[PDB]
Design a protein around this ligand. Structure first.
Ligand SMILES: O=P(O)(O)O[C@H]1[C@H](OP(=O)(O)O)[C@@H](OP(=O)(O)O)[C@H](OP(=O)(O)O)[C@@H](OP(=O)(O)O)[C@H]1OP(=O)(O)O
Lengths: 220, 220, 220, 220, 220
């Protein structure tokens, strides 16, 4: 990827085989859990769009998600084209023209054009826009592979509350909603879907008590 | 992460995938035990807060611990905001203001801000403050993860004292207290809760005896 | 670890994850035995006391030996303080006084003090003294961890002498004693604790000889 | 003890019979409580070692503790001799040496020598050192006569908590541990060995509050 | 305490043995009566903080009261330190730094320093502040030691009015509340909790009857 040289300037480089192999194996091995979203951003920082496409195309199977993300990328490119008018006219060398809906995805842009965009002043974070589009695609993939919603989790009659709250938060991180709704649901559902002793302890503690005191007092 | 270059200035470096994989596997597989706390400082030396956040959020399972750590990070950010008042006025030329509560967590600051802060003169160890906050969170989560205290541990009559003193030290190191309190515990409770035969042998030997003669006294 | 640049100065560096991972794995899978003593000395060359204590604290399990070595380190630090002249008062500019008992253990002294001491003129081998203290602690630990003594081993009627002498030397190597008594005992009872047929064969060979002849005759 | 006189001169006061009678009666009434430590320091403040030794000799009964404190006073005299340079022979005019352990014990030093030491510039508070030795002796004696420890205090189901905490604080005051350890034990042991009803009341209230809030809720 | 000295500054004098004997006997006789509040002030007229500490440490029994008074002293000292300006930097002669929590408690300040504070210009009433703090502590401890509320006192048919009014007023003198609600209670409950005959007599007389008038009316 784009790696800074030893006490020098930024230079282009290819993706190391180890990183892409680790990415593809960790993607294919277990599942499309939400934890792939951070790890992806831990392996595709400062990378040109064509290398993103190369890393994307190496997935074994799960082509329905690939079609989903391709369609979302196409529609986002169309939205970008319609919102931002095309700047026509002569274009000076070194600072190329505005990228189009196909140039951002890198399907028509070449390596030299991407390097020029990266080194262009003012900076062009087209790779970052493609990365955030991939992030949205991964979010909707997690939505596709979500086993169930949050509105049906109920703690077992004798199940310890530790696993209950752990799986509740595991499902919560995969939910797609606003932050305020997430705060409201984590304040309400936790006390409304607990065992009688734990919920009586909760109501004795009253509102405004964080989960720390809740699950240190409900112990036993 | 952040590593100084040989015969050159410090330069930003991408995160090694092997380090992240080793961290996540060692966190997920063994336990939430104290020995992982030093290992963290081995794998987090000289890193931006974004690197620490990425390392933290890549763990699978145990999301209650992650929520607790996030809440403690938020409260420590509030503490930093209250101890250090928000300085208004224009930004000094080439001297960005001190990071805010949301800036140390990295949720509202771009990587360039931390890159500038690390190399700024005088240096700003905001990443070290975030690392210490994470260390405090790890300490409290490993405290709550300990299922048993040290005041109720008892030795069975039908097993050697080896594993009993082993688990006594496990519980002793899993609790956070003053060094003098730990010395008092390891001076009193190591002999006040042993098997009766070993207790009488050690009473005959008298106080002020090292652990080696204690274990070699009543072998078998 | 801190390393010297070729024809240059001495620059501090972090411990590579490979070394720590290998050390913890070999500690886990190769429960304390004499051959682990050299291994540590092969993985601690040019390492600061902070690195030594970090790799020491990463161990999992068998914390009784860890407390024993911590106590021996404390008592050796006290001996160093009481023997080596402790200087106080004014300190010459550009120089710092020798590390104290708490400084050699690394509990109080900061990493910068260790870096300055290592690069000082003349250099201070505080790290090597701490390493040799750890070596003595490991020696007494492996002495403690001896499954049995050395004068009680015998040879079964259906047991070939090969694994007999193998376990004999394995137990003998775990003995902390002078070399002369080791040679004296390895020349007399090694036959007295064997099977009668090869015993009488060796006795007919003559009192004392090179062990290659004594094993070739005992073959079959 | 020597008492300063207003608008006059520093004059030694003969030991009045009132103080001796009060001390002997307060010794004979209980003879075993931490209260001897303050009261003694109120009855012998600013007194020469001769007066301290006379008051020690006047009290009778329980000669085992008296012999123990006398032999420890002898060992303190020996350590005082050995820690400080033993002065001998002629002394410089207008100056006097630090009295030895035998001299400070009140056996080989007459009253006029004590008065001269007190009136010297700088003053020599040998009486204060002897008083501190006596205080340490009383502390270790009441340690030797403590009938019960602090980890075995169990409150009966019908036993009121007021007398329980009273005797608990009695034993804690009888304890000569560190101040921080005393704070830790007052924070933990008071609730670790409490009745289940008040234990649950305190758990609902929230650990970390004043003991007055504990007692106001543990009533009944 | 501090005795008046002519043609010179006042010099502190030790507490007389008879005064402390009277103090301890009046403590041991009742230990919870409100009449100890004046008796304490009559003995501590201008007493140094060291005398107050010694006389507070000479009371035997009910160590919970000592713990509560010590903790209230600590919190009041912290409040005094935080509210009163913290003197820092160059402390010129003629004044002194603010006594801290331990300094105002006399455990980290020599007696000569306290004497100089008492005779300072302007004088520092450290002893008076400690006296009022321990007076508040005594008030709250005697509130604790009062086991009966004021709304349940009733004059029984076989109970004479004299005993009823005497115990009512004696408990009122140990009650801590507003003066207006005190007046309301002493004008309502005294006629609401009497025998019916002189209840009707007092109702016929009307509110505003003195103790002598009501006691003569209820005679018979
Ligand atoms: O990090 P180091 O201890 O210096 O070892 C590195 C590391 O290999 P390992 O992670 O297996 O130790 C490199 O891999 P990356 O960290 O860059 O992913 C590898 O680079 P290659 O993957 O390109 O082989 C490099 O080898 P080289 O110096 O030949 O580039 C090798 O150094 P050593 O070969 O000296 O152990």
């Amino acid at each position: 990827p784009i790696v800074q040289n030893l006490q020098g300037q930024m230079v282009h480089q290819a993706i190391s085989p180890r990183t892409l192999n680790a990415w593809v194996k960790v993607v294919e091995e277990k599942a499309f859990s939400p934890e792939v979203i951070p790890m992806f951003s831990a392996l595709s920082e400062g990378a040109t769009p064509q290398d993103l496409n190369t890393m994307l195309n190496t997935v074994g199977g799960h082509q329905a998600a690939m079609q989903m993300l391709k369609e979302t990328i196409n529609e986002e490119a169309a939205e970008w084209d319609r919102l931002h008018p095309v700047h026509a006219g002569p274009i000076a060398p070194g600072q190329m023209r505005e990228p189009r809906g196909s140039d951002i995805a890198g399907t028509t842009s070449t390596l030299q054009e991407q390097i020029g965009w990266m080194t262009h002043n003012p900076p062009i974070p087209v790779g970052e826009i493609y990365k955030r589009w991939i992030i949205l695609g991964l979010n909707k993939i997690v939505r596709m592979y979500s086993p169930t919603s949050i509105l049906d989790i109920r703690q077992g009659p004798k199940e310890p509350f530790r696993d209950y709250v752990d799986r509740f938060y595991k499902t919560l991180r995969a939910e797609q909603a606003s932050q305020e709704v997430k705060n409201w649901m984590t304040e309400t559902l936790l006390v409304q879907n607990a065992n009688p002793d734990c919920k009586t302890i909760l109501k004795a503690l009253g509102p405004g008590a964080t989960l720390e005191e809740m699950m240190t007092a409900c112990q036993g």
